[model samples]
Target: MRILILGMGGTIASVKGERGYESALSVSKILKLAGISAKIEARDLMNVDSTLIQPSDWERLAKEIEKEVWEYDGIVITHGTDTMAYSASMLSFMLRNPPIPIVLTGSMLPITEKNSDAPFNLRTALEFVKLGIRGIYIAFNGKVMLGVRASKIRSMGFDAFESINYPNVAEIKDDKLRILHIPDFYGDEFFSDIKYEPKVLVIKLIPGLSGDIVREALRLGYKGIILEGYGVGGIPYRGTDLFEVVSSISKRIPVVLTTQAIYDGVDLQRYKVGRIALEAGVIPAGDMTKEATITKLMWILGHTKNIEEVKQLMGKNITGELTR
Candidate 1:
């Protein structure tokens, strides 16, 4: 089967350099170590840490994938685990309804090491491609997670990402791929004219995070804001009332309230504090990882600026990023 391997450098292609580890290995070298004997085309997209990957880069990558999606059976992207979740989430929104399996994989340790998990993840990704599983996914540490739900939670451990608030899609054990749960796949449609609005801000509420911070962000020209409020989307109500500012700004722009707790997501209807937020018109981001919320805000605003429309788009499950 034909496959395209796009190496957008990560630990999977890192090797020893003068200062420290560097993304020095090429896609061909990474594929050689993967030991996959298939008709594969390798392309080196970049050789930098995933931290260097930005929104502009995601646009370029999406354009490239859109250009080549018709010519290959499947596509695999090698990405650094750090920002892979954001990149995967953004791409999932930009390239909605991908026609073929587009798997993203990388590891914690450099592939040059013997005990590194890089090659195993790559093989798992390649195997998933062969299985013809459609839509975006991430293969790492014997697990295949929906790209929209994957989040990097570990820096030194093999299990770097977890499908937050959702069941993992599949798992790879010893050369066999087992379906853990079936994820939604869209076929016969592809997205073009992908766009992103860079004027987005994410605020993780500290103890003293005041309303001025949110107001200043609005003043600074941020069109959208994602607030990671305390348990179940609770915001400060006193002089430090970020919620008050959020309530005021909800009329001007989109201010989303998600949980910092991560797992269960936000429920504005559960508590009085959250009810205040709901009354104030702050959209509760249900079961969507903060990564998805951030990117979705950008993507929605890119297409439209009406705060009402942005709120509707955010609530809609565009790429399975949210629960319902």
Candidate 2:
């Protein structure tokens, strides 16, 4: 089998540099450590912390994958766990329905350490590729999760990612592959023209949280807003101007209502406060992760400015981000 590995300089490739731990490993060295026998082609895409990765970097990575995708049997990416979910989600949207598996894996500790999880994760990612699981996924700690659903829930654990309201897509155990939740892959071919609009903002609602923040974001040219609301997508009704602010700005720009809680998604029809948001034209973001919602909004807004069009696209499951 032939695999293409793209290293984006995450903890998986980090070492103790002069100025602390920095990404200094190479993709070829990682494969050698994993002891893979398959024909391999590897390259380093970047060598920075995941926090330093931006939307522009995401776009560039997606384009690189698109450019080299068809030549290989499968692809694997080493990413920093911090923004791995975001990058995975963004790439899932950008490279819908790839014909082969695109697995992303990383380590919490540097690979240079004796007990680091980097080699295990990389070897597992290759095993999944060998299994021919087609679609975007995260392979870490014996778990494989769909890209859009995977989120980093722990800061310092081998198992740092969760599938978030979804079951594990697959699992790797003792050199065996077990399928859990099989996701429906979308589109017939890879989509290459992924565009992002950065003028988007996410606001989390808290006790005594002011709506002026949302208003100011809109004023500052944020074209879209994702409201991280309370319980089943409830927005503050009596405590602050949040209700009015959301009701007002939604008219001028697209507003999406989601739950602050990670599990079970938002339900605007479940409560009166949620209904108020619906009546004011805020779109309900279903079980999608906030990472997916934010990136999806940026992607959707890049295609159209019409609120109805945006709503239609957002509500529709374009890349299996939202569960129907």
Candidate 3:
């Protein structure tokens, strides 16, 4: 099987110079270590920090992957860690239910530096493709996770990403692939045609945080708001007009509740606070990582104008992005 490596100028592509490091490695250099002569392509989208990855870059990557979806056995994307999750989530919708493995990987350290994990990430991604699983995944820290649900949990570690609420789709062990979690291949008929407009905002719930911030976000005309609620989806519990305001906005726009913590999903069934969120028109994220929820909302908005349809789309799984 031929693998398609799409380089997005990460540490894997960086080169060490006499004075310091430079971003100059190529796809061939990375593949040489993988022991494969795979047909590869390169895109020098940007060498800027991942935080600077803009909408245009997302669009470029999406369009390229879409253009080559049929010709490659699997696709590998080397991106930066800061916004890898966002790109994956965006691409998950952009190339919905991809027929081949679309593995997105990045490194915490530059390959030009000491003890870098770039080579392993590239190799592991190739290994994941050889196993023949479809859909988007992140290969890092010896683990492969659902692209939409994965997040960069650590700032400076090799084990940088975590799937959090959902199980990783697979794991790479013993130079052999161990299929710990296999999502049923539901086929692309459900998602291959999705289009999404994600004018969404994420509101983090910090102590002493007033509801006025959320009120302002709605007034500014965000299409959807993801409330990163307190522990276990807890809101302020003020019993004030905030609840009413949330409900009001929910009727007009979709409101989804996720948790600030990494490992736990929102469990609206267990607490009055959570139920109150539901009453405020807040939809339970149900084990979906915050990244997944945002992208799913984007995908839903792309195809439907009905609020109910958007809600249903957010609630169900389309590309194994969400798990039970």
Candidate 4:
């Protein structure tokens, strides 16, 4: 099958540099190392660590993918592991219900290294392309995860990604792909070429945490806020006036609640603290990753500025971002 491989240089294409390793290789070289015989077109989109990737880059990638996705059977992306999850989530929102598989993969080590995981991850991603599944996904460490549900759970291991609050869509075993769960795929309705409101903040609630952070974000005119609170989602009300600040801010901007637990997401009606957030108009990010919530907010705000519409959109499951 013909595939379009866009290279956003990550560790998979990096090499030893003067001070540290830098992304310096091309997608063509990495594809050659994989020894694939399929008809493929490879393009180098960027050559930087994922940590340096920005929202503007995500916009460029989405625009490019939307422009060219119909020309190929599938698409594969080589990204840096540092912020691959964020990119994946952003793409998931930008390219909803895609007509072709969009698989992103990266490695923990450089492709030139002796025991590099790049080749394996890239090969697995390409193999997934043959599945003909039409959606955004991350193929890494022998597992396939939905783009919005995937997160980087490891830093030094080959198994670097996990399907948070969701089961693996598929797995690669002994050179074969195994399907586990099939998500309810959306129709041909896809949103693209959006202008993102990049002014969004994620504040984690901790012991003795001051409410000044929320006030400052509002003072800087942030469009949205994702509050990472305690298990099941709760903002501390004793040590600081965080509850008051959040409540006051929610009147003007969209404030979302997610859990610091990272697995089971925020439930605003579960406890008294959570209920208080609910009453304050903080939207519940049920079982959605921090990456997904942040990107979703950006995508939502990109299209509409109506506070009521933003709340409605965030509460709904667009592109399978939130469970139930």
Candidate 5:
């Protein structure tokens, strides 16, 4: 089977080359180290800071996916972690019921280091493609995550990703690929071929902040809002109409509440503030990463305009995003 490596510019594809320093390396250079033989196509889209990857970049990636889906047995994307989840989440919606595995992998450090995890992770990711796992997957550390549910939790650790409220799709150990969970594979009837164009915002909560920030976001004509709240999901307690600020917007725009904490899922049942948020037409983003929430919101907004319908669909497990 042919594995195409689309170089989106990350530490995995970065090597110093003959210059004697760590610089961007080609696919052939990486594969030579592992003594593995597979046809590789090196396509460098960009090497800018990952923070700059926007919706337009997502569109470009979708175009490539459309072109390569039919020609290759599987695809691997090397990307920056700062926006890896965003790319993964967007691709989940962009490529629906894809015939082959679309694995995205990258690293925290360059592969030049003796203990770098890039080589191990990249080798495992390629083997995973041979396993015929379908859907968008993020191969990081020694584990593989369903792209939509993954979040980068560690700043400088090898085990850098976690799947928010969902269980991991799979993992790799001792050079072995293990499939712990499998998503329901339905025929192409509900597949997506839609293009999304909407202004989106993710307002993070902070202590002792004025209410004007949220008001400004609402005024900016953002089509969807991902409200990052405190533990168990609560808005700011400052003297302002926090719930009302969100409720007023939800009446017109779609608002979702996800936990700001990286590990545990938010519990709306434990706090009065959370209950108020629920009453204000806020939909609970159960077990979804911040990245998943935004991409899902964008995808849902593209497919429908009705507010209630969008809320219902947010909680539903179209992909294997939810643990239950």
Candidate 6:
């Protein structure tokens, strides 16, 4: 099968010199070193480390994928694990209903280093692609996960990405791809071009994180805001001052409320404080990770500005990002 591999630079394609490790290895070299002799047509989409990857880069990647999806059986993306989940999350919304499976993979160790996980991860990604499933996914370690449901759980561990608020879509065992749960595949509804407002802000609430920060974000031109609280719907309440501020500002810009817990998402109806947020019009992020919460708001706000429209869109799950 003809497969395409797009390299965006990560430990999977890095070269360690005297100074530090830099992503200078070509996709061809990576495949060659991994002993992947499959008929894979590889391309260097971008060569930056995932730490430097931004929302704008997501758009560029999606556009590039749109150009090549029809020509290949599937596509594999080599990304850095540091920010791979965020990029994968954003792509699920923008590059929905791909005709071929789009799998992202990365390694914690540089390919040049000893016993790097790059070879196994890249090979696993190719195996997932060969399945001919039509959706966005991330193949890491020995598991395959829906892109929106995946998140980075460890900093240095080989098993870095965990399926957040969802089960593993599939797993690779003994060099074979085993299907556990099939990903939600779409029909012919793919995006020729996607619109997103990257000027979204995320505020993880700590003690005394004043509402002025939100104000400043608005003043500095953030289109939307995602506020992460302690537990399910745990926003600060000082005579409802923060709620009032958010309520007022939300009339102009969308304000989303999600929990800090990576597993269980926010439920504004749980407590009076949370319920108050619901009345104040803060959208609850139901089981969505911080990465998905931030990127989903950016995609939703790009489509509409009406508060009601934003609420409906945010409340609804588009690409399995939110469970409830």
Candidate lDDT (C-alpha), each: 0.85, 0.85, 0.76, 0.86, 0.76, 0.84
Residue 213 shift from truth in candidate 5, angstroms: 1.3
lDDT of 5 by residue, 173-259 (tens): 566888888766435642445477458788787776555666787788778888788888977555766666777778887888888
Residues forming the 10-long window of minimal summed lDDT in candidate 4: 185-194
> What order do candidates take by lDDT, descending?
4, 2, 1, 6, 5, 3
Best by lDDT: 4
For model 3, the superposed segments whose C-alpha errors exceed 4 Å read 14-38, 41-48, 188-191, 239-241
| Deviating ranges (above 4 Å) for candidate 2 | 33-37
- For 237-317, candidate 1 gives per-residue lDDT tens digits of 876767778889988988899888858898888889888888887887998988888888888889898988887888898
Query: Which residues of candidate 6, in runs, are more than 4 Å off?
Result: none
Query: TM-score for model 5?
Result: 0.88
Best by TM-score: 4
Off by over 4 Å in 5: 15-23, 26-36, 189-194, 236-238
Which has the better lDDT: candidate 4, or candidate 5?
Answer: 4
Worst 10 residues of 1 by lDDT: 184-193
Give residue 105's lDDT in candidate 4 (0 to 100). 94
Clash-forming residue pairs, model 5: 15-23, 16-21, 16-22, 16-23, 165-287
What is candidate 1's local distance difference test score?
Answer: 0.85
Model 6 steric clash pairs: none
Q: On TM-score, who's better, 1 or 3?
A: 1
- What's model 3's TM-score? 0.87
131-230: candidate 6 lDDT, tens digit per residue: 8887888999999998888889899989999998799988876668899877664767677547888888888887777787888898999888888887
